[PDB]
Design a protein around this ligand. Structure first.
Ligand SMILES: Cc1nc(-c2cccc(N)c2)no1
Ligand SMILES: [Zn+2]
Ligand SMILES: [Zn+2]
Ligand SMILES: [Zn+2]
Ligand SMILES: [Zn+2]
Lengths: 73, 70
């Protein structure tokens, strides 16, 4: 029905919000510190000296173990 | 249709996985450091001495701004 298509869209948008904002291909699993923006995968976060959301300097990157994480397994 | 019900369930489960493992009422927005477990809201994370997932000592709590926040 039309509601099947609406639910498909909601699910797709929620899953897209879980993906790295830079590469769009890998799940978010890293936090820029100290600002706290958690919007990248580990590969993109290692290459940024400034937060892509707020432009604060990145002192270091903290890996995050989230419950929403999914993998090939 | 039955497909609408299947998608409703997938959405519900993903949203439930984003809630604090202690209170089950507030969204996750805090990380235990240095272990990195990000499973609690700010209120529940504030008084824990050890991580509720892996038992590592909590040196500090880092607030996280996630794109899934609603
Ligand atoms: C809340 C909340 N958001 C997430 C989240 C956000 C982006 C990516 C991933 N994997 C999880 N988990 O809990
Ligand atoms: Zn990336
Ligand atoms: Zn930032
Ligand atoms: Zn809580
Ligand atoms: Zn832990």
């Amino acid at each position: 029905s039309q509601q099947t298509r609406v639910l498909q869209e909601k699910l797709r948008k929620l899953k897209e919000a879980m993906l790295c904002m830079v590469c769009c291909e890998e799940e978010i699993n890293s936090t820029f510190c100290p600002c706290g923006h958690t919007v990248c995968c580990e590969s993109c976060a290692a290459q940024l000296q400034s937060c892509p959301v707020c432009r604060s300097r990145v002192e270091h990157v903290q890996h995050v173990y989230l419950p929403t994480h999914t993998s090939l397994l």
